[PDB]
Amino acid sequence: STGSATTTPIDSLDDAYITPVQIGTPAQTLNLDFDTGSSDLWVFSSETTASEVDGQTIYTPSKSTTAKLLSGATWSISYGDGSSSSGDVYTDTVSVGGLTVTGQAVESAKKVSSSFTEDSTIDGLLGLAFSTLNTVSPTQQKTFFDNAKASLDSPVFTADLGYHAPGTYNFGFIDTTAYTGSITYTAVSTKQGFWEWTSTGYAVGSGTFKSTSIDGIADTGTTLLYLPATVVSAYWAQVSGAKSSSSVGGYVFPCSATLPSFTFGVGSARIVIPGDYIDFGPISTGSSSCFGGIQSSAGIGINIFGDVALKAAFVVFNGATTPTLGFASK
């Protein structure tokens, strides 16, 4: 089997991407944030505290003939941005782009933090990291991908995120028309439960490539590119007037600037992020200070190849017995 679903930016900045997901019988379609940095499939639901719902589409298990309470199971998750959610668990039929899993754990939110409430466009998350990170207790649950894997033509999924445009998540096949040149594969460590890999270096604009190992995670659920302070300083030093602002929470730059590209290494291959991808616009409406898309990972504890990086590539998440990651230009 295979699946193929379009993923669409939630706003004009590509802050996140939503992908329609069918849950239950008859289908209830919710728009979920596919997150390769976490491993819970959770949804706004008929159980979510009413004051914490503001425009989201909810899953109502009582209206699904295939829903079953997973008795005694609870979940609670906290994300790197400080947001959180928690609740109880149903199993139900879940389909993505024509690919169906029966008995998927669908984590129903009883509570969500303010950031989720305030984002009316995201109806929940679909985790695509390793199932060892799944938060369901006392019986840990598998991700949609883990459940689907044995049925897939090939044990892979691909992320093809657009810049200010829709893109695609495919399951079970590699669309050889969706990228240019060849795919370069690189080793993954699953020790922390993430799609963790080591980039071979970077360049700023037309500058020389610096060969240096940068361990980080491929995380579709993080907007920006978070890298070591040394690397980030080298980038922003090439932008007149750019500075790190503690009041704003990162690097800002004059909105009048033209940003240089940023290149990252994947083995001997190179992925180029155009300068425009690094512009996150005015810090507040009407400001002439713009927020940068490359930020320091210092104090996160991990480097994160978020959407800014991933959208510059066609990315293969290879979930074979020995997992790997592939990157191609597109």
Comparing CA positions, the residue from 174, 76, 79, 195 lying closest to residue 129 is 195
In Å, the largest CA–CA distance within the chain is 60
Query: What residues does 197 pair with on adjacent strands?
Result: 216
Catalytic position from the list 38, 85, 108, 199: 199
Collapse the DSSP code of 288 into the 3-class scheme (helix H, G, I; strand E, B; otherwise coil) and give the result: coil
Q: Which two tokens stand for residue 315?
A: 């990315």
Contact 49, 258 (CB under 8 A): no
Catalytic position from the list 14, 35, 92, 119: 35
Is residue 172 exposed (0-12), middle (13-18) or buried (19+ Cβ within 10 Å)? buried
Q: Is 35 among the residues known to form the active site?
A: yes
- Mention every residue, 6+ apart, whose C-beta is less than 8 A from residue 160: 167, 168, 169, 170, 175, 178, 179, 314, 315, 330
Domains and CATH numbers, the chain: 5-174 (2.40.70.10), 175-330 (2.40.70.10)
Comparing CA positions, the residue from 117, 121, 114 lying closest to residue 10 is 121
Q: Give the phi and the psi of residue 317 in degrees, each rounded to 5.
A: -100, 100
- Separation between Cα atoms, residue 118 and residue 10, nearest integer Å: 13
Q: Give the phi and the psi of residue 286 in degrees, each rounded to 5.
A: 85, -5
DSSP annotation of 129: S
Please, what's the b/e burial string for 295-324 (b: 16 or more CB within 10 A of its CB; e: otherwise)? bbbeeeeebbbbbbbbbbbbbbbbbeeebb
Experimental method: X-ray
Strands (E) located in 193-235: 196-204, 210-218, 225-227
Q: Is 11 among the residues known to form the active site?
A: no
Q: Which two tokens stand for residue 180?
A: 């240019």
Scanning the chain, the segments in alpha helix (DSSP H) are 114-117, 144-148, 229-236, 307-310
Query: What residues does 134 pair with on adjacent strands?
Result: none
- Separation between Cα atoms, residue 28 and residue 23, nearest integer Å: 5
Query: What residues does 101 pair with on adjacent strands?
Result: 94
This structure's resolution (angstroms)?
Answer: 1.1
Q: Which two tokens stand for residue 26?
A: 């008859």
